[PDB]
Each structure stands twice: as C-alpha cells, then as structure tokens.
Amino acid sequence: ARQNFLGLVVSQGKMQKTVKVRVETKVFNKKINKELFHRRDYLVHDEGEISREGDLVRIEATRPLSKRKFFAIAEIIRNKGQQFALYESEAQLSVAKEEAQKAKEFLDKRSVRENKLNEKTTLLRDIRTIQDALSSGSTPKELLEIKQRYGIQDFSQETVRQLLQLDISGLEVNLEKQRSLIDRIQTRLSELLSNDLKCDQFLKDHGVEDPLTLKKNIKKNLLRKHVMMDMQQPS
Amino acid sequence: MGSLSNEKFFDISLVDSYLNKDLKNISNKIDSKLN
Amino acid sequence: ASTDKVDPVLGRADTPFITRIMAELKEPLVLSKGYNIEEVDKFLAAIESAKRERAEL
Amino acid sequence: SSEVQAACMTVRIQNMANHIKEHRKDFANTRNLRILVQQRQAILRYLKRDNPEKYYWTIQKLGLNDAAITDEFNMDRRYMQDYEFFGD
Amino acid sequence: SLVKLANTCAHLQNCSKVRVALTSIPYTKLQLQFAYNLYQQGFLSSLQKGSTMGPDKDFVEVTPDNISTRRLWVGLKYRDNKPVLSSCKLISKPNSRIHLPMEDMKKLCSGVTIRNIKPLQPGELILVRAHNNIMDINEAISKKLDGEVLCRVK
Amino acid sequence: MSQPLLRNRSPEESELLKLKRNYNRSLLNFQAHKKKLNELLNLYHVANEFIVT
Amino acid sequence: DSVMRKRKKKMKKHKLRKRRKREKAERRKLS
RNA sequence: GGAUUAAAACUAGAGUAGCGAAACGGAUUCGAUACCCGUGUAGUUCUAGUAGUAAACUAUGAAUACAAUUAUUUAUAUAUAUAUAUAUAAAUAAUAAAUGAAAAUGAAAGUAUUCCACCUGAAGAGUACGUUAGCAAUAAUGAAACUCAAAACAAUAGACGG
Ligand SMILES: [K+]
Ligand SMILES: [K+]
Ligand SMILES: [K+]
Ligand SMILES: [K+]
Ligand SMILES: [K+]
Ligand SMILES: [Mg+2]
Ligand SMILES: [Mg+2]
Ligand SMILES: [Mg+2]
Ligand SMILES: [Mg+2]
Ligand SMILES: [Mg+2]
Ligand SMILES: [Mg+2]
Ligand SMILES: [Mg+2]
Ligand SMILES: [Mg+2]
Ligand SMILES: [Mg+2]
Ligand SMILES: [Mg+2]
Ligand SMILES: [Mg+2]
Numbered sequence: 141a142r143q144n145f146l147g148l149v150v151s152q153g154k155m156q157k158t159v160k161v162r163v164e165t166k167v168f169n170k171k172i173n174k175e176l177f178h179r180r181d182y183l184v185h186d187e188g189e190i191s192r193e194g195d196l197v198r199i200e201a202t203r204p205l206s207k208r209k210f211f212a213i214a215e216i217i218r219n220k221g222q223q224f225a226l227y228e229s230e231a232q233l234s235v236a237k238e239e240a241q242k243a244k245e246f247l248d249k250r251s252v253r254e255n256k257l258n259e260k261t262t263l264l265r266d267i268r269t270i271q272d273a274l275s276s277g278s279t280p281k282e283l284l285e286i287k288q289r290y291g292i293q294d295f296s297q298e299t300v301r302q303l304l305q306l307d308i309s310g311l312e313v314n315l316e317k318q319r320s321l322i323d324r325i326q327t328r329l330s331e332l333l334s335n336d337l338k339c340d341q342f343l344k345d346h347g348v349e350d351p352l353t354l355k356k357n358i359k360k361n362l363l364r365k366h367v368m369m370d371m372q373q374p375s
Numbered sequence: 376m377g378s379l380s381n382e383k384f385f386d387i388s389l390v391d392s393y394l395n396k397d398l399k400n401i402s403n404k405i406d407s408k409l410n
Numbered sequence: 411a412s413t414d415k416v417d418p419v420l421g422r423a424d425t426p427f428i429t430r431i432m433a434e435l436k437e438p439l440v441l442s443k444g445y446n447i448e449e450v451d452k453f454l455a456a457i458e459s460a461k462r463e464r465a466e467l
Numbered sequence: 468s469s470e471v472q473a474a475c476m477t478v479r480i481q482n483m484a485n486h487i488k489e490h491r492k493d494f495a496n497t498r499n500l501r502i503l504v505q506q507r508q509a510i511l512r513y514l515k516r517d518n519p520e521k522y523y524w525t526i527q528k529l530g531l532n533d534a535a536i537t538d539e540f541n542m543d544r545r546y547m548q549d550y551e552f553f554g555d
Numbered sequence: 556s557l558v559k560l561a562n563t564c565a566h567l568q569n570c571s572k573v574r575v576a577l578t579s580i581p582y583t584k585l586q587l588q589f590a591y592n593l594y595q596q597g598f599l600s601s602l603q604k605g606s607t608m609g610p611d612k613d614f615v616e617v618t619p620d621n622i623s624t625r626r627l628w629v630g631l632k633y634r635d636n637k638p639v640l641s642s643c644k645l646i647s648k649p650n651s652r653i654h655l656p657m658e659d660m661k662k663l664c665s666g667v668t669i670r671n672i673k674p675l676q677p678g679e680l681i682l683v684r685a686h687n688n689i690m691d692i693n694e695a696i697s698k699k700l701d702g703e704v705l706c707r708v709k
Numbered sequence: 710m711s712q713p714l715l716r717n718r719s720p721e722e723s724e725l726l727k728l729k730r731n732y733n734r735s736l737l738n739f740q741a742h743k744k745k746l747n748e749l750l751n752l753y754h755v756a757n758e759f760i761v762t
Numbered sequence: 763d764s765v766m767r768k769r770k771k772k773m774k775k776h777k778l779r780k781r782r783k784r785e786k787a788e789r790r791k792l793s
Numbered sequence: 794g795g796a797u798u799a800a801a802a803c804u805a806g807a808g809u810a811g812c813g814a815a816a817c818g819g820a821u822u823c824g825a826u827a828c829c830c831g832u833g834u835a836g837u838u839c840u841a842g843u844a845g846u847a848a849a850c851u852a853u854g855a856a857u858a859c860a861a862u863u864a865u866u867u868a869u870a871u872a873u874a875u876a877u878a879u880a881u882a883a884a885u886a887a888u889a890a891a892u893g894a895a896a897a898u899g900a901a902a903g904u905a906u907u908c909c910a911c912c913u914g915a916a917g918a919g920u921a922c923g924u925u926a927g928c929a930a931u932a933a934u935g936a937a938a939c940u941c942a943a944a945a946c947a948a949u950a951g952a953c954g955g
Contacts, residue, residue, distance in 0.1 A: 231523035235528045308746065315735055398460065418531070454753060494796080767945085
C-alpha cells in the first residue's frame with residue numbers, strides 16, 4: 141500500500157498549502173551496534189491548511205505535487221498545535237477582563253484610604269468618646285456622627301467590643317473545630333475497629349447489607365466513609 | 376494568670392479575653408458570686 | 411523587523427500586573443513584616459479598652 | 468504550581484533587574500539574574516506541555532509571549548544593547 | 556528503569572565483596588521480579604519486603620503514604636569461603652538496548668556471540684524481559700518469546 | 710509475589726489526609742499571626758520611651 | 763611533561779619570538 | 794552558542810609617594826650586554842574601553858547509585874541525675890577492600906550508569922599557509938613533506954652534590 145509515516149508538524153504558515161513534517165524512523169547502526177532513530181523533515185501538502193505547528197499527523201505518499209512535495213496530510217492524530225492557537229487568542233481576552241477588574245479594585249481601595257485620611261477622627265479617640273459618653277451620659281452630636289462613621293447606632297459596652305474584633309479571633313475557633321473533627325473521626329474509627337461486634341452492628345445500623353461478609357480493606361473503607369458521614373454531614 | 380494578671384506589661388491573653396467576652400463574663404461572674 | 415519583540419527579561423512595557431504590584435508597594439500606609447494598618451489600629455485600640463476593663467474589675 | 472512559581476520568579480527578576488541597572492559592573496548578580504530568567508523559562512516550558520490553556524493565560528498576564536519562553540536566551544551583550552537595558 | 560537495575564547489580568557486587576549477609580534494594584516491580592528470579596535460581600538466601608530501616612516482620616501494606624520509605628531486603632549466600640553471587644552485569648544498557656528474537660537467544664545459549672554479547676557460560680544466569688515480565692533465557696526460549704536481554708548473573 | 714505492589718488511597722483516606730494537611734498549614738499561619746501580635750503588644754508597652762516629637 | 767621536556771618547547775618559543783621581533787624591526791625600517 | 798576570566802600589553806583622560814622593564818652610570822670579572830649599587834622612563838594606581846591568554850593546577854570534566862573502619866572538628870536534633878551523654882549529616886586525616894605501570898588513589902584514581910571534551914610514535918609544530926577577530930601586541934582555527942627507531946613514565950641500585 142501507499143507508504144504512510146507519522147510525524148510532528150515543525151513548520152506551518154510559511155508556504156501556501158505546504159507544511160514541514162518531522163518523521164523519525166528506527167534503524168540499526170552496525171558500527172556502534174545500536175538501534176537508532178533517524179530523523180528527516182518532509183515537505184507535505186496540506187490541501188485544507190488545517191495542520192498547525194505542534195500537531196501529530198499521519199502523512200501518505202501521493203503523486204508528485206512539486207519539485208520536493210511527494211506526501212500529503214492524511215489525518216490529524218493529535219491537535220496540540222491547533223489547541224495552542226485557540227488558547228492564545230482566548231488568553232488575550234481573558235486576561236484583559238481580569239486586569240480591568242483588578243485595576244478598578246485598586247483605584248477603589250485608594251479612594252477609601254484617601255477618604256479616611258480626610259477624616260481626622262481616629263479609632264482610639266472615637267472609642268474614647270463612646271466609652272466616656274456611655275459612662276457620663278453626655279450625647280454630643282459627635283456620637284450621632286460616630287453612629288454613622290461606624291454604623292454603631294447603639295452605644296454600649298458590647299458595641300466597642302464588636303468594633304475592635306480581630307480576624308485572628310475567628311481563625312482560632314475555626315482551627316479548634318477542624319482539630320476536633322479530625323480527632324473525633326480517628327477515635328471513632330479506632331474504637332469501632334477494635335470491637336468487631338460493635339463494628340458489624342455499626343455497619344448494619346448505617347445501612348450496610350451483611351457487613352459481616354466483607355474484607356478488611358473493603359469494609360474499613362465503609363467504616364471510614366461512615367464515620368466521616370456521621371461527623372461531617374450531621375455537622 | 377493570663378487575662379487575670381497584675382503585670383503592667385501583660386500579654387495578648389488580656390486583649391484576647393477582652394474581645395472574646397471573657398474578662399467581662401468573669402468580672403460579672405465574680406461580682407455575681409460576691410452578691 | 412515586524413516580529414513582536416518582547417523583552418525576554420522584563421516583558422512588555424506597561425504590563426498591568428507588573429505596574430499594579432509596583433504601585434501597591436508604594437501606597438501611603440503600607441506596613442512591613444506582615445502587619446496591616448487596619449488590623450494594627452483595632453489592636454492598639456483593643457489594648458487601651460482592654461486595660462480599662464481590667465481596671466474596672 | 469508552575470504559574471505561581473513563574474509569578475514569584477517574575478517579582479525577583481524585576482527586582483534583580485533594577486539592581487543590575489544601577490550596578491552594571493556587578494557581574495556576580497548579573498549571572499544570578501541570567502540563571503533566574505532561564506529558570507523561569509524552564510518552568511513555563513513545562514507548563515505549556517502540561518496545561519497549555521493555563522500557559523497562555525499565565526504568560527499573557529506576566530507580559531511575556533511564547534517566543535520569549537521557547538527561544539534560547541543568554542541575556543548577552545547584544546540583548547543589553549538591542550533592548551537598551553542600561554539606557555545611556 | 557534500566558539505570559536502577561544497573562545500580563542494583565553494582566550494589567550486589569559491592570556487598571558481596573565485603574560479605575554482608577543482608578542488604579536492601581529499591582522497591583519496584585522490576586527490582587522485585589529481578590530479585591525473585593535470583594532467589595529461585597539459588598543466588599539469594601532470602602527476599603523480604605521492608606522499609607528503609609529493615610525487613611518487615613509482619614505484613615505492612617504498601618500505599619502512597621509509605622511508598623517512598625519501602626525497600627526490598629535480600630540475603631546473600633556464601634559457601635566454602637566464596638560468594639555465591641560474585642558478578643552481576645547488565646547486557647542491555649540504558650544507552651544501547653538489545654532486543655533479540657528467540658532464534659538469536661538460542662544461538663546465545665549455544666556458544667555463539669550475538670551482537671557482541673558473550674555466550675552463556677556454565678552456571679551463569681541470563682535474564683530476559685518480555686512484556687514487563689522477567690524470566691530466565693532458557694524459559695523464554697521454551698515459551699518462544701522475543702525479549703530484551705537484561706543482565707547476566709554469575 | 711501475588712500481593713499488589715501499591716494500593717491507591719481510597720477517596721475517604723484522601724479526604725482525611727486533606728483535612729490534616731489543611732489544618733497543619735492553617736495552624737502554622739495562625740501561630741505566626743499571634744506571635745506577630747504579641748510582638749506588637751510588647752512594642753506598644755515600650756513606645757512611651759520612644760521619641761517622635 | 764617534565765621540566766626537562768618543557769625546556770625544549772621553551773627554546774622553540776624563544777626562537778619564534780626572537781624571529782618575530784627581528785621581522786618587526788625590518789618592517790619599521792622598510793616602511 | 795553565551796558570559797566571566799590573573800599578570801603582562803594596548804586606546805583615551807587623570808594620578809604618580811614607593812616600587813620598577815628600559816636607558817644612562819658605579820662595581821664585580823680574564824670578559825660581565827648579568828647577578829650587587831645609584832639615577833630611575835614605561836608600567837604598577839583611578840575612570841571608560843580593547844583583548845580572552847597563564848604550571849588559568851587537584852597537571853584529576855559534570856551528574857547519579859553504591860561499598861569496610863578509626864580519629865578530629867562542625868552543624869542540627871534529642872535527652873536529662875546538668876553539663877556531659879545519644880543520634881544523624883558535612884569536612885578533614887589515616888586506612889580495609891578494590892584499582893593501578895607503579896608512585897599511589899580511598900569515598901575515588903573503587904564498584905556501576907549517563908552525557909560532554911580530548912588523545913593515537915618522536916621531531917617538524919602549536920610552526921607554515923589561509924581564514925576569522927582585534928587599534929595593536931596578538932588570539933582562535935591548524936597542516937604536510939623530509940628524517941629517524943626512536944621517544945616517554947613509575948620504580949630500583951649506584952655515583953655525585955659549592
Ligand atoms: K505544483
Ligand atoms: K559550548
Ligand atoms: K609612578
Ligand atoms: K596549584
Ligand atoms: K565538560
Ligand atoms: Mg533548570
Ligand atoms: Mg601530558
Ligand atoms: Mg595611559
Ligand atoms: Mg637597577
Ligand atoms: Mg571583555
Ligand atoms: Mg600565547
Ligand atoms: Mg591554554
Ligand atoms: Mg590560580
Ligand atoms: Mg547543577
Ligand atoms: Mg597562534
Ligand atoms: Mg622519573
């Protein structure tokens with residue numbers, strides 16, 4: 141049959157309807173006693189100009205098409221070259237949109253900081269008026285303004301404590317919950333495995349059919365999936 | 376002592392108990408006990 | 411000569427990502443060592459408030 | 468991730484390039500800059516093979532192009548003169 | 556990896572020279588098949604799975620969590636003040652792999668130097684890899700298999 | 710010889726592994742954050758001795 | 763190579779340098 | 794392919810104490826274009842460049858896996874009846890094995906694997922010619938003819954040593 145080769149497109153878009161394909165064949169080199177790969181670039185006809193640099197293609201022998209062209213593209217085995225072209229165009233649009241959004245979020249942050257620098261009022265001073273007015277009874281209009289600078293309509297000892305909250309405090313509680321879950325899951329499964337009877341019951345209670353007839357790994361995974369379905373789904 | 380310390384140069388325990396309603400929920404607790 | 415000659419070291423001039431990060435480092439109240447001014451103002455106010463509460467117990 | 472590594476290298480490359488522009492005789496740190504730029508090329512070349520979509524997105528955001536990444540680069544004297552690294 | 560196999564063959568030679576009774580090799584399928592053939596052929600006293608610190612006494616399932624710390628532990632044999640496993644060399648090298656048809660393997664076992672491979676000697680073991688299985692050359696000839704001539708052990 | 714060379718992690722094992730690893734990274738970040746605040750507190754205590762006016 | 767053998771190369775280099783100085787001088791007068 | 798690259802040297806502009814090719818003198822000597830002494834120019838210094846060479850040496854390319862000991866430091870870690878002790882690495886020194894023409898190497902010059910550079914008798918010769926590069930000195934590349942049966946290394950025993 142017609143001689144067919146597999147190769148990588150190494151040049152495209154330089155000649156009209158012609159691409160350069162790199163074909164590698166296996167040969168034996170008697171001198172060094174080693175089976176080597178021999179490489180050759182083929183000028184190949186691309187009637188539809190579909191192939192792109194980087195594509196893996198199969199080329200088939202044809203009639204003479206020019207001084208040096210004797211093969212044509214017969215199939216695109218892998219279209220990595222075509223993918224490269226599509227992803228580059230999308231990237232330009234995708235990145236422009238993201239950069240526009242980030243540029244607007246930077247100017248907004250700058251405006252807020254500039255606005256705050258125009259308000260001579262300071263947190264410490266404001267928190268020293270909400271704690272003196274709340275301990276003296278005075279209600280100068282500054283407080284009403286302070287009830288707008290911060291949004292704190294009510295001036296109580298439990299409102300300054302909520303104006304000065306630090307994110308670290310929230311992190312400290314999320315971390316304790318995370319540690320609890322892991323510790324509970326491990327103790328639960330550890331105990332369950334120690335008692336085969338309580339384990340068999342555990343599985344049946346959660347909806348396993350004849351858990352007794354199961355393997356150690358085929359069933360410990362069920363136990364693990366259940367212990368993690370009784371401490372993460374209920375919570 | 377932590378939050379309930381007498382040192383002039385205290386640690387972050389005191390500031391944490393304040394923002395966690397502990398130095399206040401203990402002051403009331405002690406006072407309620409005194410009552 | 412019509413090729414897109416992009417500096418392989420510094421990249422295209424006026425890249426929005428490069429410029430914005432540079433600008434952020436030169437903002438008025440940027441702090442070092444991982445501190446942010448907003449967290450430092452609340453923390454310093456909390457110290458004062460916390461001291462008053464410890465002086466009211 | 469390769470995209471993060473390239474971005475982190477970009478920051479250091481930008482800082483080191485600024486140093487070199489003021490210390491054009493500091494060949495020790497010029498060599499360090501060259502190696503770092505080549506390291507960034509290496510990580511991005513792998514990214515193009517591993518996740519082409521992310522690759523093209525990353526280089527566009529960093530201000531580079533495919534040629535800057537694939538082509539052999541030595542940051543040699545001709546580069547310093549063709550891109551006016553030191554100015555005048 | 557043929558490189559890993561080369562490392563193991565050299566390692567066994569080094570251990571034999573000093574006459575250590577027990578040593579470890581990397582934990583991989585190829586290494587395990589290689590060691591198992593040596594064990595069945597009487598070159599190794601023992602073959603145990605284990606860790607970086609020693610052979611396992613009780614079965615330890617291998618998983619991604621501990622794969623990096625796994626090792627294969629092999630016992631070397633010595634009789635009459637001579638090592639049983641004196642030499643261990645690759646035939647098919649990383650930079651020059653040798654694939655032979657069953658016809659050429661029969662010539663190699665018959666005294667004919669094929670592709671510069673010295674023929675099989677009395678009491679020597681030549682291993683062949685076919686479809687990712689390692690077997691003695693005589694067994695490959697029995698199964699009419701063509702394969703890569705990996706190494707020779709004496 | 711018949712034993713499989715490697716047993717892949719079950720989906721559940723990978724979930725518990727990710728929980729521990731996320732916890733490890735979060736705990737270290739928190740401990741560094743708290744250390745920095747404790748240094749900011751000890752610097753506030755001495756800033757009365759520093760001159761800015 | 764030993765010092766003894768190095769000395770043979772040393773002599774050849776000296777004679778080449780001596781000849782090139784001699785040629786230079788001539789060029790100066792002939793120029 | 795690129796970059797950097799001692800000393801000498803070169804192109805400009807500064808500097809010039811001391812040192813110091815050369816040169817001119819003083820000695821020594823049978824002679825002394827030397828060794829020693831004097832006066833001491835270039836140079837040695839700085840700035841901006843050219844050039845890319847050294848016994849540029851460990852005369853030993855880089856990477857990886859691995860093999861028997863001791864000593865001594867260093868580092869990290871651990872413990873305590875708190876200052877040592879126990880661990881794991883690195884460096885250095887002396888070694889086993891192994892290798893080697895031997896001298897010796899010693900974690901490589903050992904056991905192996907991968908990649909690069911390089912060699913194929915002496916002399917002619919790193920010369921000639923050409924080419925490329927440089928302001929230049931030069932640098933890189935780099936032969937053949939003729940002639941010979943030499944030529945070289947480690948080690949041994951002598952002889953000799955102002
Ligand atoms: K035609
Ligand atoms: K090269
Ligand atoms: K001078
Ligand atoms: K030296
Ligand atoms: K090399
Ligand atoms: Mg690299
Ligand atoms: Mg030599
Ligand atoms: Mg001058
Ligand atoms: Mg003199
Ligand atoms: Mg130069
Ligand atoms: Mg020279
Ligand atoms: Mg040289
Ligand atoms: Mg030197
Ligand atoms: Mg390296
Ligand atoms: Mg020359
Ligand atoms: Mg000798």
